[PDB]
Amino acid sequence: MLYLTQRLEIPAAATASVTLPIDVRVKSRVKVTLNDGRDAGLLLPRGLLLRGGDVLSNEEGTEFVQVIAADEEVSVVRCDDPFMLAKACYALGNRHVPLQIMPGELRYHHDHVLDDMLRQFGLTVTFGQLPFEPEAGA
Amino acid sequence: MLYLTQRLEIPAAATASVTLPIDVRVKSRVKVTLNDGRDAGLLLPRGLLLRGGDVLSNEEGTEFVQVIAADEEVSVVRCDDPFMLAKACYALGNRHVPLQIMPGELRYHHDHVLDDMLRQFGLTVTFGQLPFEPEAGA
Amino acid sequence: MLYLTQRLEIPAAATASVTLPIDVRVKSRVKVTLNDGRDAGLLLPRGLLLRGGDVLSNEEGTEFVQVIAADEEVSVVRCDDPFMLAKACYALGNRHVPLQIMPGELRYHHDHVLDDMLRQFGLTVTFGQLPFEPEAGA
Amino acid sequence: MLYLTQRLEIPAAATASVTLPIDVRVKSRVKVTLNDGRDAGLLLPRGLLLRGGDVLSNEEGTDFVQVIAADEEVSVVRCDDPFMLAKACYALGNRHVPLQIMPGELRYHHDHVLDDMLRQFGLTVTFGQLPFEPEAGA
Ligand SMILES: [Cu+2]
Ligand SMILES: [Cu+2]
Ligand SMILES: [Cu+2]
Numbered sequence: 001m002l003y004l005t006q007r008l009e010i011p012a013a014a015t016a017s018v019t020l021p022i023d024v025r026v027k028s029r030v031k032v033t034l035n036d037g038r039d040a041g042l043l044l045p046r047g048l049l050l051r052g053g054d055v056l057s058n059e060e061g062t063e064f065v066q067v068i069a070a071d072e073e074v075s076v077v078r079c080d081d082p083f084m085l086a087k088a089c090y091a092l093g094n095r096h097v098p099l100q101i102m103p104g105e106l107r108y109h110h111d112h113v114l115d116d117m118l119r120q121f122g123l124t125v126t127f128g129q130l131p132f133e134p135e136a137g138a
Numbered sequence: 139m140l141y142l143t144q145r146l147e148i149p150a151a152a153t154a155s156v157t158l159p160i161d162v163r164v165k166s167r168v169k170v171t172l173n174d175g176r177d178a179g180l181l182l183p184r185g186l187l188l189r190g191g192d193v194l195s196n197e198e199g200t201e202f203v204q205v206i207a208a209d210e211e212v213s214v215v216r217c218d219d220p221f222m223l224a225k226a227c228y229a230l231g232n233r234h235v236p237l238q239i240m241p242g243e244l245r246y247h248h249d250h251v252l253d254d255m256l257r258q259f260g261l262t263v264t265f266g267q268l269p270f271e272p273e274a275g276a
Numbered sequence: 277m278l279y280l281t282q283r284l285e286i287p288a289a290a291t292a293s294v295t296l297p298i299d300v301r302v303k304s305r306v307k308v309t310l311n312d313g314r315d316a317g318l319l320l321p322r323g324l325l326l327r328g329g330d331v332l333s334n335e336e337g338t339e340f341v342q343v344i345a346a347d348e349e350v351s352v353v354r355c356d357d358p359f360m361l362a363k364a365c366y367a368l369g370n371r372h373v374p375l376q377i378m379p380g381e382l383r384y385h386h387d388h389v390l391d392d393m394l395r396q397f398g399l400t401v402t403f404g405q406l407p408f409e410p411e412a413g414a
Numbered sequence: 415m416l417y418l419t420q421r422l423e424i425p426a427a428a429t430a431s432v433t434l435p436i437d438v439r440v441k442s443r444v445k446v447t448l449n450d451g452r453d454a455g456l457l458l459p460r461g462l463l464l465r466g467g468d469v470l471s472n473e474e475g476t477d478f479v480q481v482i483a484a485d486e487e488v489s490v491v492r493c494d495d496p497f498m499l500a501k502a503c504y505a506l507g508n509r510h511v512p513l514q515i516m517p518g519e520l521r522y523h524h525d526h527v528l529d530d531m532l533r534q535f536g537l538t539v540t541f542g543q544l545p546f547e548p549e550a551g552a
């Protein structure tokens with residue numbers, strides 16, 4: 001069976017790819033299915049956060065799988081004013097919410113309670129299936 | 139003496155003041171001294187946070203006192219890029235560090251550990267004795 | 277002709293690849309040959325350093341090209357004792373030599389003058405055709 | 415008086431000593447004061463680096479003076495990870511910063527600016543007053 005046991009520090013041309021959500025990209029052992037249909041198992045050393053772009057390889061060196069971050073149910077928070085986001089980041093941080101941070105934009109795992117809370121800060125909160133890359137730590 | 143038991147919904151006519159730190163403004167029961175030499179006991183309603191500028195009054199509503207936030211030893215963080223202050227606010231939010239958030243500036247109780255950490259983010263941290271008003275929702 | 281005009285901040289499943297040496301990966305305008313033969317031209321914003329793993333795409337977003345570091349002539353310096361490697365790293369930095377640093381191995385463009393110098397430090401310098409990813413400081 | 419014209423490749427019976435910062439230990443023609451009060455004049459061949467512990471002498475070959483490295487203001491980078499130190503050596507090497515290298519620790523003329531740059535590297539940088547013997551090669 002195809003087992004992906006390593007993440008190459010120096011990539012080699014991809015032979016396959018796999019599109020995974022953040023909850024799977026933090027597991028060291030688990031069964032996933034490549035985008036071409038073949039089953040495969042992750043057998044990586046623990047504590048690795050797989051980011052879109054990383055290349056996994058089988059023990060030998062004949063299979064190089066490109067990791068891609070899947071579209072996940074997230075909440076979006078956009079607003080020209082970064083100061084308001086800064087307060088949102090502090091609030092979300094205080095609640096330990098895995099968060100993606102980019103100039104002008106913020107996303108986090110869909111959660112109604114969180115949505116409405118920020119919906120009292122006056123913040124604009126939408127929803128959509130998008131790639132999710134939270135800041136390291138979870 | 140004079141008893142302060144309520145906060146007027148509308149900042150009335152001061153005519154006296156009292157300087158208090160963040161740890162005393164998060165109290166409902168406490169005996170203080172007005173900047174004018176008189177003594178007054180604070181008997182405020184539970185579930186409250188006194189902010190600088192606030193105006194306290196007695197029950198019969200015939201006396202008014204203005205609250206002034208005291209100076210405190212804080213680490214100061216100033217930066218031009220709102221993106222970086224956001225990342226800092228999140229990391230600080232995660233450590234449950236009470237924090238005063240402002241456009242382009244952060245303030246928290248002086249801490250060398252937190253200081254070096256933010257320095258690793260390329261932020262420049264300094265020291266100062268300043269009024270500290272940390273976010274209510276923290 | 278096919279033109280690659282950008283590096284997505286978020287990789288997408290690659291539909292092709294391109295294997296280039298460090299000197300080319302630092303350019304913004306240059307013609308190249310993808311691994312499937314279809315020639316293509318780079319039209320990227322100046323200032324970028326293409327790293328193995330990056331994904332390039334056009335404007336339409338229908339083509340995604342993965343960059344792979346090409347084998348190049350390099351001097352190979354292997355040595356267990358890290359301490360001695362640190363002294364070589366310092367000496368090479370001093371001479372502004374672009375250097376790849378990994379535990380137990382350093383790599384730089386094949387150069388005899390530098391090969392004889394390190395040899396006097398008691399280092400064993402060999403040769404090879406390998407991927408070269410130097411630190412972003414040269 | 416006494417004129418020190420040479421460093422012995424054959425240690426002798428040092429009578430007195432002189433404490434100097436690397437600053438003065440690079441000069442071949444400087445007037446110093448032994449720790450006993452007597453003056454001495456260094457007239458050594460050019461291009462010499464006096465190490466704490468060397469012994470100087472007069473043209474005669476009669477008297478001797480031990481060199482001691484003085485305490486200087488230095489930054490300290492103590493990291494148990496040899497891999498990270500090597501990278502630090504490289505960056506510092508690129509900036510032509512005189513550096514003392516040891517397993518687990520690095521030292522160089524204290525410098526806040528330079529310290530912060532190394533902090534962004536994820537390294538811990540402390541301060542000290544210690545002898546300073548930077549690599550001769552630089
Ligand atoms: Cu929902
Ligand atoms: Cu907590
Ligand atoms: Cu301090």
Ligand SMILES: [Cu+2]
Nearest residue numbers: 386387388403
């Ligand atoms: Cu050769």
Ligand SMILES: [Cu+2]
Nearest residue numbers: 370372508510
């Ligand atoms: Cu230079």
Ligand SMILES: [Cu+2]
Nearest residue numbers: 524525526541
């Ligand atoms: Cu200092």
